[PDB]
Amino acid sequence: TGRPEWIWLALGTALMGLGTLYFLVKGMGVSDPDAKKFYAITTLVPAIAFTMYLSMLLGYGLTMVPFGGEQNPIYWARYADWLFTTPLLLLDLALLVDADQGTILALVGADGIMIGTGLVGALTKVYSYRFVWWAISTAAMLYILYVLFFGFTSKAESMRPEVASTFKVLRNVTVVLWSAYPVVWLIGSEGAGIVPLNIETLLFMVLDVSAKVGFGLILLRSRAIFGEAE
Numbered sequence: 456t457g458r459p460e461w462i463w464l465a466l467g468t469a470l471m472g473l474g475t476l477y478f479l480v481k482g483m484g485v486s487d488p489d490a491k492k493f494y495a496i497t498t499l500v501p502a503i504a505f506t507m508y509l510s511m512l513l514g515y516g517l518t519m520v521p522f523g524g525e526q527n528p529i530y531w532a533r534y535a536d537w538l539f540t541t542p543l544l545l546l547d548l549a550l551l552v553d554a555d556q557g558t559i560l561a562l563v564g565a566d567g568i569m570i571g572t573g574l575v576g577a578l579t580k581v582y583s584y585r586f587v588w589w590a591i592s593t594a595a596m597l598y599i600l601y602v603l604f605f606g607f608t609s610k611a612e613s614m615r616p617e618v619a620s621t622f623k624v625l626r627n628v629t630v631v632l633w634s635a636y637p638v639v640w641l642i643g644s645e646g647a648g649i650v651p652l653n654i655e656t657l658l659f660m661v662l663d664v665s666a667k668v669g670f671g672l673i674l675l676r677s678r679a680i681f682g683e684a685e
């Protein structure tokens with residue numbers, strides 16, 4: 456409670472934990488193999504985020520990085536979370552549209568580059584270089600968003616209508632929410648430092664819960680997750 460952002464870390468921990476438990480209960484008894492994949496991916500996402508939020512709340516997922524002549528508090532646990540949860544969210548989208556394996560690898564690999572370069576930027580001690588890493592990570596994000604809109608055209612013709620509808624909604628949620636992350640980083644403690652760490656933590660908490668629990672609620676309530684069966 457010594458760090459003002461503790462309240463948002465505590466709320467994030469609670470919301471990710473509750474979301475995990477809800478998805479775990481909701482997925483009980485699901486037998487359809489396709490739906491099992493979506494429940495597994497979508498329950499793992501907030502479960503991982505729960506552990507990383509808790510690690511930030513308890514102080515383990517925080518480190519001090521010297522730059523700008525200050526000791527800057529950097530929550531590195533965010534990147535350990537996103538390293539696994541962001542490819543999993545992309546996998547949800549890719550499986551919906553029955554993406555080619557090559558497209559899945561392009562997405563997951565670009566996503567690993569996005570998170571890894573974000574982590575390097577977050578830990579870099581030379582201030583100006585932090586924004587070089589931010590730019591590379593943003594380029595990887597833009598590549599991901601490009602694929603989400605322009606890499607699935609060969610699947611549109613054979614796509615079930617409920618699949619197309621749910622994918623379109625989830626893709627729009629993804630573009631809007633994922634785009635905000637580089638902005639928050641750029642203006643917050645890890646970039647220019649014009650927004651204080653407590654407001655940055657609040658912003659990432661709203662984004663994370665929306666991108667994980669909100670996204671999951673939309674996906675797991677849809678008929679698109681079930682194979683077409685009589």
Ligand SMILES: CCCCCCCC/C=C\CCCCCCCC(=O)OC[C@H](O)CO
Pocket residue numbers: 557558560561564565568591594595596598606
């Ligand atoms: C001047 C620096 C130039 C280098 C900047 C690199 C840094 C990372 C930037 C963007 C991510 C690149 C993602 C690379 C993954 C591309 C995979 C691919 O090409 O997939 C095509 C295939 O047809 C399947 O759809």
